[PDB]
């Protein structure tokens, strides 16, 4: 899961 990147 990348979230905020």
């Amino acid at each position: 899961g990348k979230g905020s990147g």
Partner: antibody
Amino acid sequence: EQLKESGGRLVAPGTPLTLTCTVSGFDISDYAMIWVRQAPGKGLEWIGIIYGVINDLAYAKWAKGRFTISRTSTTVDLKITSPTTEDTATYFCARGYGSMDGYDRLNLWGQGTLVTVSS
Amino acid sequence: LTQTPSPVSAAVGGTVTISCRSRQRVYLGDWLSWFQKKPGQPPKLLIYDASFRGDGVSSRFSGSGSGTHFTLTISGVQCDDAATYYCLGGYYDDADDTFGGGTEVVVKG
């Protein structure tokens, strides 16, 4: 569902200031909270985000250390570490949809609070 | 981000289209939101994900585009549409998210 900003006031340059966004009608831990500002006569400016649904945080590439963002259970805060006249603006917080994939859909906004930086 | 220069003019009942261009591709090709902004009022979300209309937003507002080129179209223009319009580019990194310069719409009544 409502957002209310508070903390705006007149501050001398260099004097730290913390703005607060208080939440009601929903839970922060199911969303993400975003800070945006607008200096007088200028455009909207994205500042940073703090997630509740996942545990993540980001500042705009240009922040470089000008802001701190943190949460409580019912608020999110924005600290302007060393305010300049460039930081004189109306500050808004907004709720976005969130997941592992990031955020989206800023469909809820507070009314804003005014920071005035002068000697 | 580069938007249609201000001001832009439209007659009541008329149709206006404003555009937004990003140097970089937005997230999943379509992370772009449109906001209405009036003085003394908070931003109001019109379109998210390039073409999806916000809850309770008039069907007079619509958006389209992909990658780096996007538009907002206002049809059946009302005086109530007199405002500045901002696009927001969302990217893989949140730190890159940016507003466009804003496009002021002047409504000719």
